[PDB]
């Protein structure tokens, strides 16, 4: 049975690779990764000059922000929980939720693409880096190239060698007894249908979201032609709170919510606990990032707008 | 040329290559690492959104790019954030205050209650709620029954800050003997810096940071005013890295370094500066930008069920 379980898991999931994956139409180079890193930490991408990507997707805090939903410009609370940047490169479901038929600069940073490009153009070192990272382009300082540089840096923010990955690679005892029982439940209860593959989710939209009605529960939104991403569960133990709205702080409680009659699933307290223990095995090696030294503004650089 | 380098070599000292030793606060690897984790941990703030790095950003010259800092609740504060870089060498802990208040100050720990909106007890509670922090404090502060205290927190942060120094600026290399580390304009600027009396208040190892004087910049839109009649004083800041710690003065009212220099060419000091002289001095001030610290971003431990929730 232990052998059977491991083989079953090996046919449903894959481990995080050791190296950054290659991105569609966006190749990595050392200078582009360094540029992307600088941009990711540079709060001058925001109108206020106070907020960077790292503010909400904090590389030292599991790639998130420790918040129910993110706070942005003006202390405005946003509508959604910031998903982790960690392993985000492997996801294909770009948004938390939206209309199934319906499915840019961050609004919470309060800057237009042209304002961002103006800011980058005002700093010669950035212009020079853009020329090195996107060579043979007349004017490489475009919002799309900025995004590409950030994305190659994000591709490096992956977390290999979690206990579950070591289990997938062959080591049964990478998971303890409780975690192993949790894995069996995760498969038998059908969690893997929506939270499977390389990233244990992040690839599918489903007409189910968590709402306040055991205080929270899954509701069926197909009648509304509305869907939610089933998130990647990698590093879930360190990306609390949970769900699109950040309404549940306990991982065990989040699992219990997912033990929903909407899925034909029932979970005892012990079962939810075992599954939560298993989800703890998905915490990988956190990225080692040298904090970027970002270049000085000049007299041409826009002033902060608060 | 040789007389200028020699007199400079007597009035200033270069930034050391090693972090200075802090009395009663030994740097150990684990204490430095802990200090770093704390410096970047926004759970030191009530909101869990603001860390020391938010306002003293290691990648932005140790400051925040703002006229005055924006803290908890998007509240604009009264003062410009001074750089963390080389702050270890300073003695004047405040931008300004009453002379009777700032006289006989003793060095105390960082308290940022308005900025971060946490009390010392709330901070200690937060740290005690995370086993990895408790364990790190025990390693960094051996032989103490309960090492998780506000003072030890501050000590750990202080040993980390001691590493945030910027050696090998062109001026420092000039001090160490390389005349051509400064170009012609910067060299002209240095002579002016000495001759015009700037060094009187912006002298020594950090080119300032050690004295309070009864002069502050108030609303060529800004000028120095004499505040002795009001028994009030202002810090003469360390000018190290000044080219990258704009905007300038206590209120962050002047964005141009040349203009800041021109304001400091004040009749209040008996100093007169031509425009060319202010440009020359500003060029010299640019030579004070040192090597920026290379910091591996800390991986900070997960909160637990005991950890206070964000208070926005
Ligand atoms: C340019 C800087 C930023 C970058 C590169 C970035 C990156 C990302 C990524 C990769 C995702 C989706 C992850 C996935 O597909 O698995 C995302 C979504 C999100 N980010 Fe950011 N982010 C940035 C700035 C911010 C800031 C400053 C905030 C907080 C104020 C924030 C909050 C969010 C939120 C709430 C979502 C979920 C949006 C939704 O699906 O409705 N982001 N971001
Ligand atoms: C007991 C089995 C399951 C477990 C343990 C489980 C686990 C979880 C967890 C921990 C989250 C929160 C992730 C985060 O916030 O980053 C989540 C969210 C989600 N899961 Fe599951 N899941 C299970 C079954 C399913 C199934 C079968 C589906 C698809 C039909 C699914 C779809 C989703 C969706 C759409 C969300 C986002 C909901 C929202 O944010 O409102 N889950 N799941
Ligand atoms: C615990 C984290 C923090 C640490 C360790 C820290 C460190 C320091 C240091 C060392 C100084 C004086 C510099 C010197 O002595 O040369 C200072 C002053 C100052 N910092 Fe911070 N700081 C922290 C948090 C913050 C935050 C979050 C903000 C912004 C909201 C901020 C804004 C300021 C301002 C405005 C001053 C000048 C205060 C005055 O003199 O009136 N600090 N800080
Ligand atoms: C032309 C000669 C001088 C030059 C080039 C010069 C340069 C500067 C610069 C660049 C600043 C802004 C530093 C910052 O914001 O980080 C400053 C501030 C200051 N300097 Fe000078 N300085 C000169 C003469 C003096 C003298 C003689 C004194 C003392 C009597 C002095 C005391 C101060 C004080 C108190 C401040 C802070 C004022 C405020 O923030 O309102 N300076 N100086
Ligand atoms: O820096 C801030 O004030 C923030 O994150 O909102
Ligand atoms: O901090 C929490 O609430 C957690 O880890 O579940
Ligand atoms: O950005 C500025 O204004 C500067 O460098 O003086
Ligand atoms: O963390 C601190 O030092 C504070 O909040 O005063
Ligand atoms: Ca979350
Ligand atoms: Ca400043």
- The CATH number of residue A177's host domain is 1.10.760.10
Contact A241, A81 (CB under 8 A): yes
CA distance B77 to B115: 8
Q: How many CB atoms lie within 10 A of CB A11?
A: 8
The CA A250 to ligand 3 mean position distance, Å, reads 34
Q: Which of helix, strand or coil describes residue B226?
A: strand
Domain match, A171 and A292 both: no
Distance, C-alpha B46 to centroid of its chain:
24
Question: DSSP string covering A30-68, please?
Answer: HHHHHHHHHHHH-GGGSSSS---HHHHSBTTTTTB-SSS
Structure tokens at B146: 């309960």
The torsion of the CA quartet A219, A223, A224, A229, rounded to 10 degrees, works out to: 50
Per-residue burial over A203-224, b if 16 or more Cβ lie within 10 Å, else e, is bbbbbbbbeeeeebebeebeee
Phi and psi at B5, nearest 5°, equal -65, -40
Contact criterion met (CB < 8 Å) for B59 and A66: no
Q: Could you identify the residue written with the tokens 């894959």?
A: A14
Cβ contacts of A74 on chain B, cutoff 8 Å: 74
Domain match, A272 and A153 both: no
- Choose the closest CB to A67 out of B48, B58, B67: B48
Cβ contacts of A70 on chain B, cutoff 8 Å: none
Domain match, B188 and B233 both: yes
Q: Ligand 1, closest atom to CA A51?
A: 27
Q: Which of helix, strand or coil describes residue A181?
A: helix
Ligand nearest to the CA of residue A276, numbered in listed order: 2
Q: Could you identify the residue written with the tokens 């400091």?
A: B264
Omega before residue B247 within 30° of 0, cis: yes
Domain match, B297 and B160 both: yes
Domain match, B10 and B34 both: no
Domain match, B151 and B32 both: yes
Structure tokens at A11: 């046919």
Number of domains within chain A: 2
Cβ contacts of A66 on chain B, cutoff 8 Å: 42-43, 48, 303, 310
Give catalytic status of residue A4 as yes or no. Answer: no
Sheet of A226-229, strand order: A97-99, A226-229, A205-206
Contact B89, B238 (CB under 8 A): yes
Domain match, B126 and B171 both: no
Domain match, A246 and A295 both: no
The CA A35 to ligand 3 mean position distance, Å, reads 29
The torsion of the CA quartet A230, A233, A239, A240, rounded to 10 degrees, works out to: 70
Domain match, A51 and A119 both: yes
Q: Evaluate: CB of A90 within 6 angstroms of ligand 1.
A: no
CA distance A75 to A79: 13
The CA B249 to ligand 10 mean position distance, Å, reads 6
Domain match, A141 and A64 both: yes
Q: In terms of C-beta density within 10 A (0-12 exposed, 13-18 middle, 19 or more buried), how is residue A4 classed?
A: exposed
Q: In terms of C-beta density within 10 A (0-12 exposed, 13-18 middle, 19 or more buried), how is residue B306 classed?
A: exposed
CA distance B283 to chain A (A): 15
Domain encompassing residue A226: 1-18+159-285
H-helix or E-strand spanning residue B224: strand B223-226
Residue A29 half-sphere exposure toward CB, CA atoms < 13 A: 11
Q: In terms of C-beta density within 10 A (0-12 exposed, 13-18 middle, 19 or more buried), how is residue A101 classed?
A: exposed
Ligand nearest to the CA of residue B156, numbered in listed order: 3
Contact B289, B244 (CB under 8 A): yes
Quick one: closest CA in A to B241, which residue? A296
Domain match, B153 and B173 both: no
Contact criterion met (CB < 8 Å) for A66 and B48: yes
What is the experimental resolution, given in Å to one decimal place?
1.5
Domain match, B154 and B302 both: yes
């Amino acid at each position: 049975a232990a052998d059977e379980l491991q083989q079953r898991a090996q046919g449903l999931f894959k481990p995080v690779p050791a190296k950054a994956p290659t991105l569609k139409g966006n190749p990595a180079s050392p200078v582009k990764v360094e540029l992307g890193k600088m941009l990711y930490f540079d709060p001058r991408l925001s109108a206020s000059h106070l907020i960077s990507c790292n503010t909400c997707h904090n590389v030292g805090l599991g790639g998130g922000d420790l918040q129910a939903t993110s706070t942005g410009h003006g202390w405005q609370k946003g509508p959604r929980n910031a998903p982790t940047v960690l392993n985000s490169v492997f996801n294909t479901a770009q948004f938390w939720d939206g209309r199934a038929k319906d499915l840019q600069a961050p609004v919470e940073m309060n800057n237009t693409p042209d304002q961002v490009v103006k800011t980058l153009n005002s700093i010669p070192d950035y212009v020079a880096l853009f020329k090195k990272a996107f060579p043979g382009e007349k004017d490489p300082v475009t919002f799309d190239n900025m995004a590409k540089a950030i994305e190659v840096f994000e591709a490096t923010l992956i977390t290999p060698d979690s206990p579950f990955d070591q289990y997938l690679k062959g080591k049964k005892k990478a998971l303890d007894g409780k975690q192993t029982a949790g894995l069996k439940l995760f498969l038998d209860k059908g969690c893997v249908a929506c939270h499977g593959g390389l990233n244990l989710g992040g690839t599918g939209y489903f007409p189910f979201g968590v709402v306040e009605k055991g205080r929270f529960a899954v509701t069926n939104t197909a009648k509304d032609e509305y869907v939610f991403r089933a998130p990647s569960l990698r590093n879930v133990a360190i990306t609390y709170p949970y769900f699109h709205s950040g309404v549940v702080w306990s991982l065990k409680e989040a699992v219990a919510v997912m033990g929903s009659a909407q899925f034909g699933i029932k979970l005892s307290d012990d079962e939810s606990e075992a599954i939560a223990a298993f989800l703890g095995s998905l915490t990988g090696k956190q990225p080692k990032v040298v904090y970027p030294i970002m270049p000085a503004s000049t007299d041409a650089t826009p002033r902060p707008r608060l």
